Every structure is written in structure tokens, then in C-alpha cells.
């Protein structure tokens with residue numbers, strides 16, 4: 001394994017790997033970490049560029065994944081992918097894919113032209129139909145996964161998984177001092193705990209002797225380092241290595 005690795009550069013033909021989405025005022029991170037990583041993997045193991053609908057995951061998985069905008073279980077989301085599959089769907093107001101995201105983007109602890117995020121957003125309905133003008137039908141646009149698994153709390157194994165199969169989904173404990181992240185390798189030094197937050201890990205590296213994980217957040221591009229952040233690697237820091245889930249697309 002190399003000292004550094006960026007999935008964005010290792011797979012130039014898979015643009016989704018470098019895109020950052022916005023969960024809006026909804027606790028749907030569990031669904032985003034998943035559909036983002038899944039999109040990357042569908043592109044990596046079929047070389048087809050397709051943005052998997054976060055809308056489909058968040059609204060149609062049900063209790064098996066948790067409680068919609070109230071939070072969910074990452075590994076459950078990958079399970080739903082292997083059971084029911086996922087349709088395509090782009091960004092809010094994009095009109096791309098079968099089911100585009102229906103929750104408006106917002107400012108996540110930063111100032112901007114967007115409305116501030118307000119954690120109070122309800123889970124949209126599970127509508128099994130594609131937006132008008134889209135083809136094929138909801139049923140026909142389903143992308144299925146052929147396996148759903150959990151990577152061990154092991155740095156080398158997690159690095160190996162990403163190295164061979166692409167980005168994975170993970171989760172960590174967010175503390176108040178993380179909200180203001182801008183650059184460098186994040187390390188929790190103070191602040192109360194805000195709760196668990198699922199994300200997408202697409203690589204690793206070392207910055208001034210400090211090893212880290214290259215992570216993609218779901219709070220838009222004006223947050224952090226263009227939507228991404230780096231976090232201490234090798235110490236299960238604030239749980240970053242304790243909940244790694246991924247899977248493979250059917251061929």
C-alpha cells in the first residue's frame with residue numbers, strides 16, 4: 001500500500017468521485033455516504049456514469065435503514081441496494097435521473113447565498129415513479145448491488161478495500177470544533193458532541209507527519225475544503241475506522 005492515495009486521481013473516468021452533494025435540512029447522511037460511494041463503485045466496476053438517487057434510498061428503504069431524515073444505519077442502506085436496488089437521481093432542481101433530490105440545499109455552519117440549514121425537514125414520500133420526461137420506468141431504472149459487507153476496524157484493511165474496490169462509507173462522532181473546519185488534518189481538541197455523522201472515504205495521505213483519511217462531506221462545497229476534509233488516521237479517531245461499510249455492484 002502506498003503512503004498516499006486519492007480515488008479522484010486513480011479513477012479519472014469516474015467524475016462522481018469528486019462531486020460533493022448537500023443533504024439539506026435533513027439527517028440523511030446515512031443515505032448520502034452510501035449512494036455517493038455506490039455511484040463511485042458502479043463507475044469503477046463497470047468500465048457507465050450514474051448518480052444514484054439519494055432520494056430513493058432515503059425515502060424507500062424504510063425501517064431496515066432507520067428513520068429517514070431522523071437518521072439511519074449505513075450498512076442497512078447498502079443492504080437495501082442489494083435487495084431492491086437504487087434508481088438514478090441528481091441534485092435538487094437538477095431534473096437529472098429518475099428521482100432527483102427533493103430537499104433544498106442550505107448553508108451548513110457557514111455564510112452564503114443559501115438559506116441556513118434548519119435540522120427540521122421531513123422525510124419525503126416513497127414515490128415509485130420517475131420524474132416526468134425520464135426513461136425508463138422506475139422499475140427499469142433500478143441498479144442492484146450484488147454484495148453488502150462491513151470492513152473491519154483496521155487501518156490496513158480499510159486502505160486495502162478502498163485501494164482495490166473504491167470509496168467506502170463510514171461514520172464518526174462530530175464535535176462542535178469540527179463544524180468550523182477549513183483545512184489541514186482535523187483532530188478533536190474541544191467541544192461537545194453533536195452526534196454521529198456518516199460520510200464517504202475516498203483516500204488517505206500524510207500531512208506534516210500526520211497521517212489522515214481523505215473524506216467527502218454532504219454539506220455542499222462552501223463548507224470545509226471545497227466540501228472535503230482530512231481527519232487523523234490510525235487511531236480510530238472519534239470513531240472514523242469503527243463503522244466502515246461497502247459492497248460491490250452486480251458486475
Ligand SMILES: *[C@@H](C(=O)O)[C@H](O)C(=O)N[C@@H](CC(C)C)C(=O)NCCC(C)C
Nearest residue numbers: 027028029030066067071072171196198
Ligand atoms: C446523519 C446526518 O447528520 O444527517 C444522521 O444523523 C444519522 O444517520 N445519524 C445516525 C448515526 C449513524 C451515522 C451511525 C443515527 O443517529 N441514527 C441511528 C438512530 C435512528 C433514530 C434509527
